[PDB]
């Protein structure tokens, strides 16, 4: 029940659940949400929100889908918007970027603390401190933007970001990040419209691996 029931994956690995995978926790109104945990990876305890890994699954896709969530717990997906807001909401959440190239080089970037907020407020993204890792940092740029789609431009440009760039994201004027981008496979000669983290490949290679996860600060 929710009253004995795990509130996140930290929970979980206190319990004894120590390989990753699919598990029931109950959000703060008590809903229950199957969500992905990650218990392998520094020191363990993440709920991840997205994942990519071999472009099977389309990213280009409208506020709703983003707002419910899509893709495979076998494969891709994006959590849902409503739900990432939904586990960002209690006490303070430390997030990670993992990220992986086709020469196989494993990178990853890490911030202090991670919020979105509700629908009434496009899903704005509240971000802290940036505390380093092998990636760079390619996402402090994007601190209190809304979230936009092609179909809602939420960002601060005159342009649409979303339908340029061709994404999903907290979007500026327009990215430093894009990893809901289109799957391109490694280097690219369209311009930062790939799964692109600037501040380590830059904007025109896409990478094979995006995984973004958060646990109790
Ligand atoms: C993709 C994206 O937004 N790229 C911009 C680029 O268009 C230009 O404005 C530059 C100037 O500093 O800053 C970024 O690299
Ligand atoms: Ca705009």
Not at 32 to 61: A, E, H, I, K, N
Not at 80 to 107: K, Y
Not at 188 to 199: L, R, T, V
């Amino acid at each position: 029940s929710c009253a004995t029931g795990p509130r996140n994956c930290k929970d979980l690995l206190d319990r004894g659940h120590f390989l990753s995978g699919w598990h029931t926790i109950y959000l703060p109104d008590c809903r229950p949400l199957t969500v992905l945990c990650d218990m392998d990876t520094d020191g363990g305890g993440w709920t991840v929100f997205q994942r990519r890994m071999d472009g099977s699954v389309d990213f280009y896709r409208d506020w709703a889908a983003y707002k419910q969530g899509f893709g495979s717990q076998l494969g891709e997906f994006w959590l849902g918007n409503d739900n990432i807001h939904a586990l960002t909401a209690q006490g303070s959440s430390e997030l990670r970027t993992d990220l992986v190239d086709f020469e196989g080089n494993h990178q990853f970037a890490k911030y202090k603390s991670f919020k979105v907020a509700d629908e009434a407020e496009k899903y704005k993204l509240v971000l802290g401190a940036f505390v380093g890792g092998s990636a760079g940092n390619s996402l402090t740029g994007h601190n209190n933007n809304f979230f936009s789609t092609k179909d809602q431009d939420n960002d601060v440009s005159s342009s649409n970001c979303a339908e340029k760039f061709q994404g999903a994201w907290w979007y500026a004027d327009c990215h430093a990040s894009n990893l809901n981008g289109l799957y391109l496979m490694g280097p690219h000669e369209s311009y930062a419209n790939g799964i692109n983290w600037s501040a380590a490949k830059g904007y025109k290679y896409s990478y094979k691996v995006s995984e973004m996860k958060v646990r109790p600060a």
